Amino acid sequence: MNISDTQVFVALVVALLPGLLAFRLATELYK
Amino acid sequence: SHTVKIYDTCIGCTQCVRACPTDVLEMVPWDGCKAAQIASSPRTEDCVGCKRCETACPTDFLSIRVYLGAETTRSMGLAY
Amino acid sequence: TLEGQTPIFGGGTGGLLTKAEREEKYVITWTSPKEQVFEMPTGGSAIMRQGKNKLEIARKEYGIALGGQQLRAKFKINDYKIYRVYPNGETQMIHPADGVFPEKVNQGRPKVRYVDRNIGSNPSPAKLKFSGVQPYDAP
Amino acid sequence: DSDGIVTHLTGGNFATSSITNNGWLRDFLWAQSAQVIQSYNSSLSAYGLMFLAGHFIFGFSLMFL
Amino acid sequence: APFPFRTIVSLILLAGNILVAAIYFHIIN
Amino acid sequence: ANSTLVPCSKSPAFQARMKNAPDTYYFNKPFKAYAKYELCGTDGLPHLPLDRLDRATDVLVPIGLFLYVAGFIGWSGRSYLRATKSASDPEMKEIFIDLPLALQSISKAVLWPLLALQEFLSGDLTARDEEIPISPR
Amino acid sequence: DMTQLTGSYAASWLPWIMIPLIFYILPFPVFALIFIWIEKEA
Amino acid sequence: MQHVFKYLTLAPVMATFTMVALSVVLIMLQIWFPGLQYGTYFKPTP
Amino acid sequence: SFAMYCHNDTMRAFGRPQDMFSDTGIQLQPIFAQWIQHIHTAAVGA
Amino acid sequence: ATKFPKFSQDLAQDPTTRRIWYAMATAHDFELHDGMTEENLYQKIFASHFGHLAIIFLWASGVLFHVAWQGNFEQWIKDPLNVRPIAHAIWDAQFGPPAIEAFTRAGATNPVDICYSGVYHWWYTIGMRTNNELYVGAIFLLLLAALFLFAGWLHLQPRYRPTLGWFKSAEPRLNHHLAGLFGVSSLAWAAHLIHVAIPESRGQHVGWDNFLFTPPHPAGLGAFFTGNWSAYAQNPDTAQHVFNSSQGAGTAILTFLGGFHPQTQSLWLTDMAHHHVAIAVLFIIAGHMYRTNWGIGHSIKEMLNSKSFFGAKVEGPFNLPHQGLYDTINNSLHFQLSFALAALGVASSLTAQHMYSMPPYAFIGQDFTTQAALYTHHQYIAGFLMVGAFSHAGIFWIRDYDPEQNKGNVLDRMLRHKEAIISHLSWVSLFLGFHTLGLYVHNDVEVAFGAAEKQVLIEPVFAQFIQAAHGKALYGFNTLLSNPDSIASTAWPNHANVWLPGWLDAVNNTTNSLFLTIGPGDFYVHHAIALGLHVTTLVLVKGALDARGSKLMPDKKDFGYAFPCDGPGRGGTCDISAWDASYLAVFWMLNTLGWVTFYWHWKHLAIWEGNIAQFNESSTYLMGWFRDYLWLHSAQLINGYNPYGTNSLAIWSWMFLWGHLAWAVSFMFLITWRGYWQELIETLVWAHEKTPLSFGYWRDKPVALSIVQARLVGLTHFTVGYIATYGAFLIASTAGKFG
Numbered sequence A: 001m002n003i004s005d006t007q008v009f010v011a012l013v014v015a016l017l018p019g020l021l022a023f024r025l026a027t028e029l030y031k
Numbered sequence B: 001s002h003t004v005k006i007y008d009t010c011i012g013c014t015q016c017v018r019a020c021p022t023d024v025l026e027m028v029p030w031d032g033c034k035a036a037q038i039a040s041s042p043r044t045e046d047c048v049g050c051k052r053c054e055t056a057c058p059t060d061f062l063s064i065r066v067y068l069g070a071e072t073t074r075s076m077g078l079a080y
Numbered sequence C: 001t002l003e004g005q006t007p008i009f010g011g012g013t014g015g016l017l018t019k020a021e022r023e024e025k026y027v028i029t030w031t032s033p034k035e036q037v038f039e040m041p042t043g044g045s046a047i048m049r050q051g052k053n054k055l056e057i058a059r060k061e062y063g064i065a066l067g068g069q070q071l072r073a074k075f076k077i078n079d080y081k082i083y084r085v086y087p088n089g090e091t092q093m094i095h096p097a098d099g100v101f102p103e104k105v106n107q108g109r110p111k112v113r114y115v116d117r118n119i120g121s122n123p124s125p126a127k128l129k130f131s132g133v134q135p136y137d138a139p
Numbered sequence D: 001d002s003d004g005i006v007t008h009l010t011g012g013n014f015a016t017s018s019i020t021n022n023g024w025l026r027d028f029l030w031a032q033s034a035q036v037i038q039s040y041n042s043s044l045s046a047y048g049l050m051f052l053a054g055h056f057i058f059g060f061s062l063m064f065l
Numbered sequence E: 001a002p003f004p005f006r007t008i009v010s011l012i013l014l015a016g017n018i019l020v021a022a023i024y025f026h027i028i029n
Numbered sequence F: 001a002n003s004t005l006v007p008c009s010k011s012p013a014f015q016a017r018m019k020n021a022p023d024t025y026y027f028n029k030p031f032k033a034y035a036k037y038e039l040c041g042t043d044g045l046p047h048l049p050l051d052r053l054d055r056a057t058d059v060l061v062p063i064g065l066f067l068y069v070a071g072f073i074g075w076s077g078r079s080y081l082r083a084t085k086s087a088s089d090p091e092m093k094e095i096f097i098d099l100p101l102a103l104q105s106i107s108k109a110v111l112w113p114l115l116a117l118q119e120f121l122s123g124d125l126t127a128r129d130e131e132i133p134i135s136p137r
Numbered sequence G: 001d002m003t004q005l006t007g008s009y010a011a012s013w014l015p016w017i018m019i020p021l022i023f024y025i026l027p028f029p030v031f032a033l034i035f036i037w038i039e040k041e042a
Numbered sequence H: 001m002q003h004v005f006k007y008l009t010l011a012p013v014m015a016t017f018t019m020v021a022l023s024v025v026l027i028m029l030q031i032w033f034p035g036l037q038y039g040t041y042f043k044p045t046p
Numbered sequence I: 001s002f003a004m005y006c007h008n009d010t011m012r013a014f015g016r017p018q019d020m021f022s023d024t025g026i027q028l029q030p031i032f033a034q035w036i037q038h039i040h041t042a043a044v045g046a
Numbered sequence J: 001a002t003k004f005p006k007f008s009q010d011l012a013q014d015p016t017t018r019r020i021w022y023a024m025a026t027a028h029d030f031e032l033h034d035g036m037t038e039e040n041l042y043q044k045i046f047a048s049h050f051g052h053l054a055i056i057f058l059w060a061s062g063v064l065f066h067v068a069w070q071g072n073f074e075q076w077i078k079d080p081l082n083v084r085p086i087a088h089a090i091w092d093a094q095f096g097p098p099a100i101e102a103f104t105r106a107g108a109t110n111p112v113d114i115c116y117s118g119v120y121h122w123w124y125t126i127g128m129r130t131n132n133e134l135y136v137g138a139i140f141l142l143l144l145a146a147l148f149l150f151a152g153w154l155h156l157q158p159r160y161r162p163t164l165g166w167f168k169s170a171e172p173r174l175n176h177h178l179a180g181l182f183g184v185s186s187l188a189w190a191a192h193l194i195h196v197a198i199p200e201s202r203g204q205h206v207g208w209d210n211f212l213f214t215p216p217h218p219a220g221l222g223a224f225f226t227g228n229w230s231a232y233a234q235n236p237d238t239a240q241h242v243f244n245s246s247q248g249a250g251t252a253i254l255t256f257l258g259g260f261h262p263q264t265q266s267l268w269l270t271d272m273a274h275h276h277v278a279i280a281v282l283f284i285i286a287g288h289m290y291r292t293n294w295g296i297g298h299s300i301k302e303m304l305n306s307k308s309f310f311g312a313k314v315e316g317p318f319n320l321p322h323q324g325l326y327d328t329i330n331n332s333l334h335f336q337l338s339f340a341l342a343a344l345g346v347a348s349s350l351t352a353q354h355m356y357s358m359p360p361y362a363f364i365g366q367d368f369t370t371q372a373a374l375y376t377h378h379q380y381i382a383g384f385l386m387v388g389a390f391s392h393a394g395i396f397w398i399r400d401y402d403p404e405q406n407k408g409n410v411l412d413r414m415l416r417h418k419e420a421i422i423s424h425l426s427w428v429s430l431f432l433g434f435h436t437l438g439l440y441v442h443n444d445v446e447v448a449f450g451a452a453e454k455q456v457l458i459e460p461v462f463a464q465f466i467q468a469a470h471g472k473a474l475y476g477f478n479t480l481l482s483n484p485d486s487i488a489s490t491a492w493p494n495h496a497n498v499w500l501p502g503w504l505d506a507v508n509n510t511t512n513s514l515f516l517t518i519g520p521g522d523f524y525v526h527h528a529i530a531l532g533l534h535v536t537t538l539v540l541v542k543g544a545l546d547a548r549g550s551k552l553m554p555d556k557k558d559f560g561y562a563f564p565c566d567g568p569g570r571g572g573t574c575d576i577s578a579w580d581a582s583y584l585a586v587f588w589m590l591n592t593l594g595w596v597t598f599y600w601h602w603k604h605l606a607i608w609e610g611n612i613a614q615f616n617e618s619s620t621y622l623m624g625w626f627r628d629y630l631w632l633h634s635a636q637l638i639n640g641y642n643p644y645g646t647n648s649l650a651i652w653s654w655m656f657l658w659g660h661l662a663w664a665v666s667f668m669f670l671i672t673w674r675g676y677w678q679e680l681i682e683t684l685v686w687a688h689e690k691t692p693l694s695f696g697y698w699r700d701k702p703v704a705l706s707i708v709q710a711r712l713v714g715l716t717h718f719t720v721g722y723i724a725t726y727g728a729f730l731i732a733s734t735a736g737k738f739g
């Protein structure tokens, strides 16, 4: 029994947090 | 542009100046050698970096050294 | 303005390009004792006129090759001059810079990019870290 | 044969196998090299030795190039 | 120069090689 | 003691190869030599071990024979090269072999192990470090 | 059936849209962004 | 004639003569004593 | 010439032989060479 | 000029397409950036390392998420020996029905890939059982990566940017990384094995919901504090234990049995727990060696600069001058990176050599394709790391080494006899190459002429003796551990060889890879490997030691690490830079690792087939490798698709040709050189300018790739084709004949 629809959607929303922080770090390193 | 330096071991044989295909080098008065002249590189903006001058230099080690640097249109030898 | 008659040439594919009209162009002028056939720097043969000639070339190396290896070495013509022409019309004569050919020593020429040591005494790059000075440029 | 029926050396596989270079790799290079790859301990063993000799010189040349 | 410190370490290391070869040749167990 | 190698004359796999071998010059006598003298593996092929105090001459004879010949060639070339250095045109002596000099170098190289020992003891074998061309560090 | 791409996993419609998006929808706009970035005059 | 003798002492000529002479020696050793192997040299034929 | 071979490899790997450049798929008949063969055969009367 | 690249005005003023190429190539060379200071160099690197750590955690999160989402982990638990693990689903809209059916397997109803990384076996051993547990781990790694991404941004803010002195404080960093990063992490992992993994292997579920009140051992922590440590080793798992069940399961948490679990054929979980317990203690002790803030502890600078050995005057350690080295390493990031890459390269080789022989994961030794993939993966990575160690060693010589502060020390001595080092490495390479190749072709001619008995077949007696010394009684030797009466086997004073009965059982088991039997075929290939190791070292060492200069180029240090040449003068100077030696060494590293992985794969293929005699009789001549390994095992790979249909190997067939194509393209970049293409590009420039309706025009003037860039691009195609071609063959030839 693999993960459900809600778990996949939750992982997508959670992955936004490292996504935005990756952008912040990349732009900071560009300075 | 490339950087062309002339060191004190130059013997003033004028061979580097004759070998230059873009007239970067000229011979100037000097007193450090019997020929009483030394190579100079006043026009390094026209230097392409072919290193023909180093090939022509008879001293050991080279009295003239070319250091390839920032590339421009004329240093890349571009007719376009 | 640069005066002279262009050599007889039927056209070629190795002539000037957009760079001549946009960034810079070069012109080589010389005087010949007779009408004779020479080789264009970018391929093909052209006929230089009886009087004084004027040739437009894309690169400075073309003028040094034509004037140095053909005009002087082959046709015994020693009065060729190379000009740099800008799109705005400004023209400066760049070869020979002071009227004397560079291979012949001329008084009043300063020493440019001369290092007062043998090449083996250049400092190690570790000594010049974070200073922006190359070993060959070190005092 | 006596009836005029022709069986070809590779059975007419050029039309369907040569249109891909996997077919060239498999049905031409791999399949038709069986004779030279299995020529050891036979009269064709010289061709087997020269098959490896050619491979050696090709790789050897890459050092210079 | 006899190289004292050089040859002492060399002899010690060579002694280990001989000792291992002794076990390998069934001279000692 | 080693048990995975047995004498070839007692290896059934080797006997199968011996029986099935072609009856030519290349297999008649060599197979008999392998049977008496060689140790065979489970595949029936002779194997050369280095874990035997016995048959040590089987290891030392080929090794010593090669080292003497290789040293003979090396000493012939070295002594010939050293003799041509004093010549006016040593390079010309290398594309043109000097027969009297080559024969002399070859003759002395027969006793190369003795000559090399004498040169090493007298310090003539090697040149000093400071007298050898090197590149800047 | 095995005549089409399917998914027994949760939200199998996600590869149906994400594969086109990442591989042949967004990459050209992304290349345009990078191209503008690397060609900007100082 | 002395020029021909000088030619025969050339490095390629001497290398060819030496290589051929050594090749012949090794070839005849294969004909007279085929199948020589490590652990078999200088042993009597069984 | 070559990229259509790569096209054929990908179509065959996909299990889509009908999309290949082949006699049984998208045909590329060398009609001019076929025409020459017919002309040269009919020239002698065969 | 252009804004891009921000770090180089010299590139930003370049009017050609070379500007874009070189910006990407020098973006991470922070030391050459415009106006770069030493403090800003370390601060930028420190934040970059946070980004790389986050990328690793995101990568591990993706592996976990796709298995929990599209894999078959729970089904694979019930039958690990017969169920194919699923990597992820396939969504390629260009698939046809035959391709969809071919890739629909392993119990799935959609096309899937078969995992070959071994993560199923790893997660199974460490106690993971459900897809929800994998999902929670994936979510946790997403948050962990977010933490490190924030940390990198935080440590770039003005108040949190560390000073240069903080980066240069070597002793506190060594103390914390030994005791804390290595020791405490090892202790925490042993805790996970004791508290979670071991109970889960005995049918008992331990998770965050019940681990606080579920002791791992009946004796509890009282046995630890009272000195009754032997209670933890009592009642181990029985030889009839069934993994993931309580049948035949003991209660011990720290045993030292040795050998393998009889069913899983992998290392005992309780053995691994005691391993990381002992490792943690050793590394925590090692983390107290150097002085930081309390006087006690060694000073590395003092140890290197020391000149007195209990009063006696010595040059230094081993009577060798090590003075001035502390500043050399501490100021050279390339010197530190060289050691770090070399250590990781050796560790990656040791991982490959020890994971196949002593599998640490349940049933992973029976997943033949996974075993081949993991060994090849970590050996090739090790080879790349080894090249990098010497590459940055050559960079150290040019950029960070100065003779004045290293005068007369051990580093200077190496540079002063570089000719002896290089010439002797050349001799070893020539000796190995002449005789290894010569013996191969001698065996080639004998076998070809029907005289296989006339082959030279040198027995690897020295390595066979080592195997016997480790307990392998097959060879008949009676030395050390293969001799039960030997003092090594008995351990006469204490008889504490509680490892030996398990170790000997695994050593003499004929069904595992622990000390595989070796014959003459194994002797020759190790000497091929030795040749590859010595030549690749020769190319790398010669480049590093000649980086400062040579007779041909005395002033090479003034030109940098990577330059094309010094012109056609002085005979010609192609590939003269130290970078070019690293470029040449990658070819030899690929060739050496090719020989290594060819040998590992063919030997294991014969064993898995049940045809060990094939390898033993054919590996002694090169035609046996070419015929019975390459030609023989390519048959099923190249039939992944054919005029009759497609199977699951169609991807490895297409990738097999894709690797050959990339390899072929590299030859163009490597054989043809720049000036040919620059002249061709000039002709195309003319054509574009004279063609109507072509309104486009280059903002960057098109130029041929630079001389150095061509070597890099060609090497990249050569390497990518090398890896892709062999990876496809390795997977297809093993998975096509097995699970």
Ligand code: F6C
Residues within 6 Å of the ligand: G028, G029, G031, G032, J684, J687, J688, J691, J693, J694, J695, J696, J697
């Ligand atoms: C931009 C613009 C432009 C234009 C317009 O405008 C053009 C045009 C021309 C004409 C004139 C001619 C004819 C055409 C053809 O056929 O070929 C091509 C094809 C195609 C397809 C090309 C392409 C086209 C265009 C590009 C289009 C685009 C569109 C798209 C879609 C976009 C997309 C975008 C996204 C974002 C991705 C040509 C050519 C040539 N090219 Mg050339 N281009 C250009 C671009 C480019 C680049 C980038 C490069 C690099 C890669 C090159 C390259 C090349 C070479 C090698 C050659 C040859 O050989 C040729 C010749 O010379 O002959 C004679 N070139 N061209």
Ligand code: F6C
Residues within 6 Å of the ligand: F069, H019, H022, H023, H025, H026, H029, H030, H034, H035, H036, H037, H038, H041, J434, J435, J438, J439, J441, J442, J445, J446, J454, J455, J456
């Ligand atoms: C390193 C490596 C290697 C090695 C090491 O070890 C070797 C060795 C062997 C042996 C064991 C034998 C016999 C020995 C003798 O002879 O013995 C007598 C003598 C004496 C005792 C002594 C002698 C001495 C001398 C004379 C001295 C001089 C030398 C010189 C210097 C050399 C140089 C010269 C030149 C060469 C010309 C043999 C033989 C064979 N082979 Mg074999 N090898 C090889 C190489 C090779 C290659 C590449 C190939 C291809 C070509 C082949 C081929 C062949 C064939 C076909 C055959 C035959 O048949 C034989 C037989 O049977 O087997 C069994 N393989 N081998």
Ligand code: CLA
Residues within 6 Å of the ligand: F073, F074, F075, F076, F077, F078, F080, F097, F102, F105, F106, J423, J424, J426, J427, J430
């Ligand atoms: C003249 C005889 C001679 C002698 C005594 C040596 C001696 C040496 N060479 Mg050497 N070499 C020679 C010729 C010789 N070389 C020639 C002709 C070449 C060109 C192919 C080389 C190429 C060479 C390389 C590339 C290397 C050596 C190395 C070495 C050293 C150890 C390995 C060795 O013995 O070489 C083994 C032999 C070879 C590698 C090839 C030589 C084989 C040729 C065919 C011998 C020719 C002999 C000559 C024609 C006889 C003429 C004599 C006659 C006029 C009387 C050692 C100092 C190695 C080194 O520096 O290690 C420290 C190393 O890397 N040599």
Ligand code: CLA
Residues within 6 Å of the ligand: A011, A012, A013, A015, G014, G015, G016, G018, G019, G022, J055, J058, J059, J060, J061, J062, J063, J065, J066, J088, J089, J090, J091
């Ligand atoms: C680095 C980890 C990683 C990797 C390599 C992959 C790989 C893949 N994913 Mg995936 N995924 C991941 C993490 C990862 N996943 C995570 C954490 C999630 C939960 C948010 C998802 C959710 C997800 C969905 C919903 C789908 C895929 C799909 C796919 C496949 C097609 C690519 C795609 O559509 O991307 C889609 C990617 C996302 C929706 C988000 C990815 C988020 C990760 C963390 C980004 C990682 C960025 C990376 C580290 C930076 C690279 C730096 C650069 C220098 C290389 C491919 C096998 C598709 C598939 O299964 O096709 C069959 C699909 O539909 N993924």
Ligand code: CLA
Residues within 6 Å of the ligand: G019, G023, I009, I010, I011, I013, I014, J089, J090, J091, J092, J093, J094, J099, J103, J113, J650, J651, J654, J723
């Ligand atoms: C026209 C040819 C073509 C095209 C365009 C595609 C396109 C695609 N196929 Mg595909 N395929 C084809 C032919 C083709 N296929 C054929 C002929 C077969 C055999 C029948 C297959 C079999 C096949 C399978 C079995 C799978 C695909 C998948 C995919 C998708 C992933 C993209 C990809 O393949 O890698 C594109 C690669 C990248 C974009 C690289 C990502 C960037 C990273 C960061 C690079 C990092 C490099 C790495 C670190 C270094 C090497 C590491 C390595 C050693 C492990 C994509 C939709 C996969 C899928 O479903 O994806 C969801 C999948 O599982 N295909």
Ligand code: CLA
Residues within 6 Å of the ligand: J024, J025, J026, J027, J028, J029, J030, J337, J341, J384, J385, J386, J387, J388, J389, J391, J392, J395, J561, J562, J579, J582, J712, J716, J720
């Ligand atoms: C932790 C390991 C590590 C670290 C921190 C570094 C760091 C550095 N290396 Mg180094 N290196 C390493 C490992 C490492 N390397 C290894 C293992 C090797 C052996 C292969 C090398 C070989 C090497 C050479 C030969 C050179 C460096 C250079 C450099 C410096 C500049 C980086 C650069 O050129 O810009 C960034 C460069 C790139 C991004 C290169 C592009 C990518 C290449 C072509 C790989 C091809 C991509 C492939 C298809 C897919 C990969 C995945 C994809 C996501 C990229 C920098 C300090 C250079 C230097 O200091 O100049 C003086 C230099 O010349 N290194």
Ligand code: CLA
Residues within 6 Å of the ligand: D056, D058, D059, D060, D061, D062, D063, D064, J426, J427, J429, J430, J431, J432, J433, J434, J437, J535, J538, J539, J584, J585, J587, J588
């Ligand atoms: C099949 C391919 C191949 C082969 C055989 C070699 C062989 C060699 N390379 Mg090499 N190399 C190659 C490809 C190859 N390379 C490629 C593609 C690259 C990338 C550019 C390199 C890069 C490279 C570097 C950077 C270095 C080498 C070195 C070496 C030598 C070390 C091994 C040795 O001494 O063995 C012994 C010699 C051999 C096995 C060569 C074959 C000898 C033949 C068989 C003797 C036959 C004699 C016979 C009479 C000839 C017939 C007559 C004929 C002349 C007409 C050796 C000559 C190293 C070196 O020179 O160190 C000494 C070194 O530094 N190579």
Ligand SMILES: CC1=C(/C=C/C(C)=C/C=C/C(C)=C\C=C\C=C(C)\C=C\C=C(C)\C=C\C2=C(C)CCCC2(C)C)C(C)(C)CCC1
Residues within 6 Å of the ligand: F050, F059, F070, F071, F072, F073, F074, F075, F078, F112, F116
């Ligand atoms: C027992 C044995 C073994 C082993 C051995 C060994 C281990 C050895 C070592 C050795 C060594 C460790 C050595 C060293 C050396 C050193 C040096 C240093 C040298 C030198 C030399 C020289 C110098 C030479 C010279 C010469 C001569 C004499 C002649 C010719 C010429 C020449 C010049 C070359 C084996 C198993 C193999 C086999 C069996 C037996």
Ligand code: SF4
Residues within 6 Å of the ligand: B006, B009, B010, B011, B012, B013, B014, B015, B016, B017, B038, B039, B053, B056, B057, B058, B059, B062, B063, B064
């Ligand atoms: S060629 Fe060399 S020696 Fe002659 S003038 Fe020029 S720099 Fe001086």
